[PDB]
Amino acid sequence: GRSLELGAADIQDLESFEAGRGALPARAYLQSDAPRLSLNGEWQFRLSPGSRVAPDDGWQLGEALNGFESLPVPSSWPMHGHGAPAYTNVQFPFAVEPPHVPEANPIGDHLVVFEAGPEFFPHALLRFDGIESAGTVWLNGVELGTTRGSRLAHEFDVSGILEQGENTLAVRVAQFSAASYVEDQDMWWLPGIFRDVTLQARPAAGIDDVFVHAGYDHITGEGILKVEASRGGQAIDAVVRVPELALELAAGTEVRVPAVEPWSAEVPKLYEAAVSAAGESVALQIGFRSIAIEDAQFKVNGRRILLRGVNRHEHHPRLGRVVPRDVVEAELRLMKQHNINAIRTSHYPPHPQFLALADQLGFYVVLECDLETHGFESAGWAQNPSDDPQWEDALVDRMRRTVERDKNHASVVMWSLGNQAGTGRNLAAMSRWTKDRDPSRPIHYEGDWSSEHVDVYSRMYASQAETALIGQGIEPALNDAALDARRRAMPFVLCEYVHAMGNGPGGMSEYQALFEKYPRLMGGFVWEWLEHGITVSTADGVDHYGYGGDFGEEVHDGNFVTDGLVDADRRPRPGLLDFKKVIEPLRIDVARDWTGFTLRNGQDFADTSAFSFRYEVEADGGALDGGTVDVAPVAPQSETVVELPGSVAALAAGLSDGRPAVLTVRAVLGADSAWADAGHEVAWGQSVREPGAPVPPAPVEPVQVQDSELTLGPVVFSRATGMPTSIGGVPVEKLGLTLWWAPTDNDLGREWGGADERPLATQWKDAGLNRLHTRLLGISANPGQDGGETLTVRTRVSAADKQYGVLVDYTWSTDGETVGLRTQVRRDGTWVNRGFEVEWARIGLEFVLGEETELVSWFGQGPHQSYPDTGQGARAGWFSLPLAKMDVEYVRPQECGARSGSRSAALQLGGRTLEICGDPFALTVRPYSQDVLDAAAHRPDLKADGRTYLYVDHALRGVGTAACGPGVLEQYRLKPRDADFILTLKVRS
Amino acid sequence: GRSLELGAADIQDLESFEAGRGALPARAYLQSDAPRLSLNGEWQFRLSPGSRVAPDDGWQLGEALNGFESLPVPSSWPMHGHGAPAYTNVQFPFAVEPPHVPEANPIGDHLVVFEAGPEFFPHALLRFDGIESAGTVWLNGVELGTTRGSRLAHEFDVSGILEQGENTLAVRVAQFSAASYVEDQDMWWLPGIFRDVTLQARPAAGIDDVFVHAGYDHITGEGILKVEASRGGQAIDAVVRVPELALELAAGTEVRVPAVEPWSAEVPKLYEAAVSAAGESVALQIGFRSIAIEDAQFKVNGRRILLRGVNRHEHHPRLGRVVPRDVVEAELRLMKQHNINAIRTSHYPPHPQFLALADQLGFYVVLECDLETHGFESAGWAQNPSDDPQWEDALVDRMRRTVERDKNHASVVMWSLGNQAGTGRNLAAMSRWTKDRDPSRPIHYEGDWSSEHVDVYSRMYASQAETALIGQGIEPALNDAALDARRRAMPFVLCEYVHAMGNGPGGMSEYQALFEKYPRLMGGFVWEWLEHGITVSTADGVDHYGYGGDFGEEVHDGNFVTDGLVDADRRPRPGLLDFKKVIEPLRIDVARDWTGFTLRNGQDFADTSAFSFRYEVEADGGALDGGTVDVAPVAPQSETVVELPGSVAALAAGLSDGRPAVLTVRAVLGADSAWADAGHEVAWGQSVREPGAPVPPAPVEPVQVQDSELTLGPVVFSRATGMPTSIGGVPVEKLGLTLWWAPTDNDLGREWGGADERPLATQWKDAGLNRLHTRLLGISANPGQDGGETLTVRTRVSAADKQYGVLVDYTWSTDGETVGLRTQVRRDGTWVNRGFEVEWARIGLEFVLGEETELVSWFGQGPHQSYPDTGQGARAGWFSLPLAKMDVEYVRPQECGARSGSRSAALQLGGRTLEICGDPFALTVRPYSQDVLDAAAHRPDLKADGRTYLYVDHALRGVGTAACGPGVLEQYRLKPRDADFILTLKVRS
Numbered sequence A, B: 001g002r003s004l005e006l007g008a009a010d011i012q013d014l015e016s017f018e019a020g021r022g023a024l025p026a027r028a029y030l031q032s033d034a035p036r037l038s039l040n041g042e043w044q045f046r047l048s049p050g051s052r053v054a055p056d057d058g059w060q061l062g063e064a065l066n067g068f069e070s071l072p073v074p075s076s077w078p079m080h081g082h083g084a085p086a087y088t089n090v091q092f093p094f095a096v097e098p099p100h101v102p103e104a105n106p107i108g109d110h111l112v113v114f115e116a117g118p119e120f121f122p123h124a125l126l127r128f129d130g131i132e133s134a135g136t137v138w139l140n141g142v143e144l145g146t147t148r149g150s151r152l153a154h155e156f157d158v159s160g161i162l163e164q165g166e167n168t169l170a171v172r173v174a175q176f177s178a179a180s181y182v183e184d185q186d187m188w189w190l191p192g193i194f195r196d197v198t199l200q201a202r203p204a205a206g207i208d209d210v211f212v213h214a215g216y217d218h219i220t221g222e223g224i225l226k227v228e229a230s231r232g233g234q235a236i237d238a239v240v241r242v243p244e245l246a247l248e249l250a251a252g253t254e255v256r257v258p259a260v261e262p263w264s265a266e267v268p269k270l271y272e273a274a275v276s277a278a279g280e281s282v283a284l285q286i287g288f289r290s291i292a293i294e295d296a297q298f299k300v301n302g303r304r305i306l307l308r309g310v311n312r313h314e315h316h317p318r319l320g321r322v323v324p325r326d327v328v329e330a331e332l333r334l335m336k337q338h339n340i341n342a343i344r345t346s347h348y349p350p351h352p353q354f355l356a357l358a359d360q361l362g363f364y365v366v367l368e369c370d371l372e373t374h375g376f377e378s379a380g381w382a383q384n385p386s387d388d389p390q391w392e393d394a395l396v397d398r399m400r401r402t403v404e405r406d407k408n409h410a411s412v413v414m415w416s417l418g419n420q421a422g423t424g425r426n427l428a429a430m431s432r433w434t435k436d437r438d439p440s441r442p443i444h445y446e447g448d449w450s451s452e453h454v455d456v457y458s459r460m461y462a463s464q465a466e467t468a469l470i471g472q473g474i475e476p477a478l479n480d481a482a483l484d485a486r487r488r489a490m491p492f493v494l495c496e497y498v499h500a501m502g503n504g505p506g507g508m509s510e511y512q513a514l515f516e517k518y519p520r521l522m523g524g525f526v527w528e529w530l531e532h533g534i535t536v537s538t539a540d541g542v543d544h545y546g547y548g549g550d551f552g553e554e555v556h557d558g559n560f561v562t563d564g565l566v567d568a569d570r571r572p573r574p575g576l577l578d579f580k581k582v583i584e585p586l587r588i589d590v591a592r593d594w595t596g597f598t599l600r601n602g603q604d605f606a607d608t609s610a611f612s613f614r615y616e617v618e619a620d621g622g623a624l625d626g627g628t629v630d631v632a633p634v635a636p637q638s639e640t641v642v643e644l645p646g647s648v649a650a651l652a653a654g655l656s657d658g659r660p661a662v663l664t665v666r667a668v669l670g671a672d673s674a675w676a677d678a679g680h681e682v683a684w685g686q687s688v689r690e691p692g693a694p695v696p697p698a699p700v701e702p703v704q705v706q707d708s709e710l711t712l713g714p715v716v717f718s719r720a721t722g723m724p725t726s727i728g729g730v731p732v733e734k735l736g737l738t739l740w741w742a743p744t745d746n747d748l749g750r751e752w753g754g755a756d757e758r759p760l761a762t763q764w765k766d767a768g769l770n771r772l773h774t775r776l777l778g779i780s781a782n783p784g785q786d787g788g789e790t791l792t793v794r795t796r797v798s799a800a801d802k803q804y805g806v807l808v809d810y811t812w813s814t815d816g817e818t819v820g821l822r823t824q825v826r827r828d829g830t831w832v833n834r835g836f837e838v839e840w841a842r843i844g845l846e847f848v849l850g851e852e853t854e855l856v857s858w859f860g861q862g863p864h865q866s867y868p869d870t871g872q873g874a875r876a877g878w879f880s881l882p883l884a885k886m887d888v889e890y891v892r893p894q895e896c897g898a899r900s901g902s903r904s905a906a907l908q909l910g911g912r913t914l915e916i917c918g919d920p921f922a923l924t925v926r927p928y929s930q931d932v933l934d935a936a937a938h939r940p941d942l943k944a945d946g947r948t949y950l951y952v953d954h955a956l957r958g959v960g961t962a963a964c965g966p967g968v969l970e971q972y973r974l975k976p977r978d979a980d981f982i983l984t985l986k987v988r989s
């Protein structure tokens, strides 16, 4: 019969399996002297909820615009009130039935008027560097075409459509399209024209495309240069000038430069070049380097390299997918400042401006195509576009555009087909296309472990153990003997490892030792550089980051998008401070006798001439000595023993026994670089003269007994509970055993393997670890010394409904000045619950004091937190921080702020100071309780209550990376056990 | 050394394994002419948080009372502001380490001054009928003793301690003691002196104990009477008078009464008797009945009986464990009014006054000892007191006191050792003790399935299938051949079945048919009679019930305590209305031709003389005919065919085809009974002349097309969505498919068996059933009739991230007056998620109307809700209720209120009325959405939004009893399938 539905045609276009239509051939992004006009600025924007109600009212013509309001472009429009951001990880936010699209599909109509001078005639084009996800483009009312591939560039010919003077550009953007099925990255869904829009003139006798080939003969030191130039796809005559190298050559001819300085992330040497035809000149930066796979090793310029990498998404906490250039420059500088040398453009090509910065600052780049079909996995990959022939042209297009845009950049050392897209015919087609087009760069793809269509073997989150087996070449064989032979000849990369969500990542050091030991291991890229937090405010206007669910999403994945080394505003997390140290390119081992240090240059190409080597001896009262020592340049992968000045060793010999002192040797920048100023720290090592264990105070002065209180020097006990009620005028509200901490994001993740896959957080809750109860068994005084008396308080700790417990005995002693506390812990019964062994977070004490703390000082590791499998970046020394600065501003509050390896601590409580000494303990000080910390979903929920929560831990569990990847390694697990530890306390007024 | 802890002695007493000390021998509760004074009234009360701080300040003497305030006694003191109620099911609220007690142990000091006249001298006693959990008792400063067994009676001799005139009674009650380990019932923890306190004189030549033996010879009709009387444990001479039977006999001699009328729950004949010694007379009610197990059947007075039972806890929503006498009488009347004939005193003996009411109203009683160790189960029963020899005397005591108190009551037909206490030596000792003491009553205990120490085979929540196998005697054998032979000779009882939590219970009819078919099946007792809800109010003072967690509990079990047939205030839930019908003691099957009905007397002893048999024919406009028919008494377990007056059949023959009419036959009380008034309904049956399927309207008048709307008679469609936007001026805000409902408590329970034990609620959430999305595929008009046109709207329904869907096509038609809606549903793809088949809650439509509804009327089943496996109590007829009265006030809001079997419906929306007809559909009407219903944890969270949510379901799932016991039976499950159904709509103004 009849057909009455609306918008069927717009929707049928959105449901297209094809690439964009009407676009010029894909080419490089080129700096050209051709006239250009940026259309970035204030556009007009109208939002309709779906195609069926998007007006077809000739709005493209620019006149009589009702419903339109101002909107900046580039933009991610949900970041400007229009709709809301939405976060899913794997799950699609719409029903999975490709190529169909939901009825709720935000449609954004963009319109801008601009002036086209005569220099854009006769020929010109319009360039869009990114539209998420489907663009339709009209100029002065005529349709130029459509765009597909949200992070890829499209160029449309406007010759004979651009009119001199006023022009009107109209763009209809659909959030969802068939392309959404192939853009399922773990990140926010954010439609918009989110990258540059540019009018460019195309002069006659110009240059459309250039393909730089710049190799390096590491034996002769020769460069191998060929620069290809074309117009309309055909090779053209052009001249290539490289002044610094005294070169003038024809485009299209290979020459041998007698001697070039080769490009690497370490020494990113770049030669300025120009490719000139009659009507247009293109300016290039040329880095001479050759990539090769040899002996199951990934080599640049003849050397195996070590990738110290991160996964870099593009995200801004207020602008969405638009990352301003000053943020890009700052964050790339920040990466270099933390010894990073490699970037994976997870999981799509970056802004085109990124590539020149990577060339200049020096990163080995894995440039990744915009392709991810992860949400088909949950259905056994049924309908996976990667293996559906109908999607072949769309996916080859995506790969073509990815390669063509960035093929001229030395920093790109690998092409990646995409991410988490399964296996399939279209991936093979993308590989063959890339391999034919650009043999000079190995192909990467992790989704197909057989590695049939790639040149490197890539995995995500392989455990340290499996990595060690791969490093030795003894991983299990593939069933296919041919494929196994190929894959065993491949070097191995962790495209994602040590997931950096919340407190953590743990186990980074164990990976690094393998990277150093085994040449086949190329290194690894941390998942991920940044947290995708989005700024939002509450009533009082206090700012904080939002995550999945905080924007009304029907389906989401919560804080899983906040999984980074820096926050959305690029403030480092402790994991980055640790990472910087783990990947430091020099190793400095200070001799115990302070006569010198062993120095190993862990770089691949550079020597140590860029570094100044500094030493300082610090003591309780500050610096005793310091200076700089001169070090003959150490070659890459070599080592030497540097003598320290004799005054240092002599100072060590003169220290009275038990006086703590720390010798630190640092390698800093001898001069300003392009990524940091002179004096910036790159590497360091220490040797510590530990303080002698604190003398327990003689048990002098007998305990005083009263009706309800007991008194032992400065300590007052409740005779009912047997617990201290004040120490030296400091009110104590509670003292008890701790075995639990507020779960980290890692603790909320499933630990696969074994019959028990409950997250540790759930194991703890089931076991009652968060709700310990204490029963008093007895209190007794015993002869001490010369009248004095110790006080022993015996308790048992358990939880409601459990038969297992620990016996905890506190023996107190005092000489009137310092208080001696010995704690003994003994397992009672079998610590099994729900059929599995219970594990502990800690063995420690919680002191709850009835006064606030202004300042915390300690001798130990710092300044930032450290847990058994983290804190590589925490060095030995003396530290002091205001209470608030002891905390860590994770988006979801969780256990954090512990300072492991403390020998002494001092809390300033108003006018008094509480001092704690003893054998190594971890230190934590909070203005709120653990229950307040666990309950909080965002930082504003953390309310101070005027108390001080002081945690002193004899033992801590590790933090691992169980949110995604390995849990805590065996050596850092904490099974129930017996324990004993001494402390001394003292209050100064 | 020294020992400084406080309260060690009080705590060591609380940790005692022994029974109470200093108490008189256990005896019956006896109505005596001895002087008595109740000390119930306003006592003084002081609360301390534990033994170590409970003052030892001579408070027992009554002078200088600081910290004391007024408190009524009996009381559960947390119900009066002192502390808070706390609910755990299985889990103990304290660490499990018997006999030890937590430091947080509320200690309640009770004190009262009273006057003792001379009639309490020389000898007297003090009687406590219940103290939870540990009592210490002083009178005028001297310690009488202690109490253990919280629901058991203790009596202390006060001779020479009671002083003439003023006396001061002091009682220190500890909430927790070693006894708590054996009182772990699924209920609130509520300390207090919660039952009577009584001063009783003990005259010389009195009677301390009496033991009535009153058997019945069902062959001769003789009574067998022996009344034992004792003083100080020794048999004494007394005279027994039974006037009605012309008997005067000696105590201690067995006589044969020539003819007695025997006692049963159906005919609770009681003979008044007095047992008199010189100094005291005891008044008794004697019911002659004999209990016997024969041929694997439980028989009373020579007949197998059917138990129609409930589990009766003692709970009051504002007074806790104190249940006022008028509530006890009312609720027992209410039970009889719903055909219940049996009570299990779950899981402790009731108030002593209960036993006379049960004798008088008529219930077969399972009287259960106060014993439950359920919380040791989770540890493999390690340390279970039931098998720990140190607990033998305490547990034998409990059983002794239980039996001695109530052994004289005919209503007690079984003794139960306790509940969920595992297996063990002490249970065997309790059984042997009871068996020696009172052979006249079989022993019940469910915890030991081997049944070694019991006389009946008892289970909880055995499935209908397993019950059928037990009923046939073909359940699997025990390993022990001797024990198997014993158990197979036992009749079988479900001490708990068809858990009545929230919407439900389902599957009651399938159990009942087995009880009727198989003599070995004794029947069953529903878990439980009442919800243990506790009254609380919010800001505006609106009252509602609280459950676990609503009182600050650290560990609890939420609404699992609200699992009853009536609410805390004894308002019936729909499950009780269904239960009443399922267990109705007469079966009335009305003949299709309306000539008569088959009547089966399902009683065990009584005939049908107590019933008046009434008929009524009702039609659309009300009653057409009615009257009473006389029925010659039908013997128990017999049946007959009763003719109806010829006018009834003739009326059926005269009905024009399609005119609905309902013949109902009811058996009501011919005269007032002791539990209801004359006319009270006991049983009923119906025969319905169904209305003819509604004629679909001729598809006349063609559909009108506009830019954004389509019009088809009274219906206006949105051309974008293709859905109605108004019908006859009634705004329609949404129309779509439903497959999901707000989970019931049953849906939140694990369905054991199979690899999938996710609750159904979780299966639905994982599957996206609660978040369906609809895509429009096409809208088309088609030739109807004489110009007219149908309108077909094709849609697909799925959910985000899922590949499965349903195709839903709506074909609309109208003649200008009525609207015809045909809906077609077709499965698209395989409905599997997380590896398991998805099940649906329903196949229906949700109409969301933009106006409120005042009234709902329908022809179908009613007046209360009905689901496929419930609604036995809903009868056919015409019903009309205000919107609010369509809802069901479950404590936790959940799916409820559906009216299955509807043929027509009418919603009054202000001035207009919306009418729905069609083949059988279920009807639900709410002022709030399903998401609001699912989110709500208490009724105050249900906010009306001014809309009407109308649900019309072609198919519904059952509700089952999966919260505890069987899920939905196979025949009521709802697997994805294709479906089609027609409806007609019409708006009257």
Ligand SMILES: OC[C@H]1O[C@@H](O)[C@H](O)[C@@H](O)[C@H]1O
Binding pocket: A022, A023, A024, A025, A026, A027, A400
């Ligand atoms: O012009 C349409 C097509 O032209 C091809 O030559 C080119 O490889 C593609 O980039 C595509 O855009």
Ligand SMILES: OC[C@H]1O[C@@H](O)[C@H](O)[C@@H](O)[C@H]1O
Binding pocket: A422, A423, A447, A448, A449, A450
């Ligand atoms: O390419 C084959 C691989 O595919 C992955 O998706 C899978 O998780 C691996 O176990 C491996 O089989």
Ligand SMILES: OC[C@H]1O[C@@H](O)[C@H](O)[C@@H](O)[C@H]1O
Binding pocket: B022, B023, B024, B025, B026, B027, B400
């Ligand atoms: O008087 C103490 C004991 O006396 C026994 O004769 C009696 O069986 C028990 O009830 C117990 O109370």
Ligand SMILES: OC[C@H]1O[C@@H](O)[C@H](O)[C@@H](O)[C@H]1O
Binding pocket: B422, B423, B447, B448, B449, B450
């Ligand atoms: O008495 C033996 C029984 O004990 C129960 O606790 C158990 O759940 C049953 O499976 C049965 O073994």
Ligand code: NA
Binding pocket: A089, A090, A184, A185, A186, A372, A374, A420
């Ligand atoms: Na992914």
Ligand code: NA
Binding pocket: A742, A892, A893, A894, A933, A934, A935, A936, A937
């Ligand atoms: Na938290």
Ligand code: NA
Binding pocket: B089, B090, B184, B185, B186, B372, B374, B420
């Ligand atoms: Na229980």
Ligand code: NA
Binding pocket: B742, B892, B893, B894, B933, B934, B935, B936, B937
């Ligand atoms: Na709910």
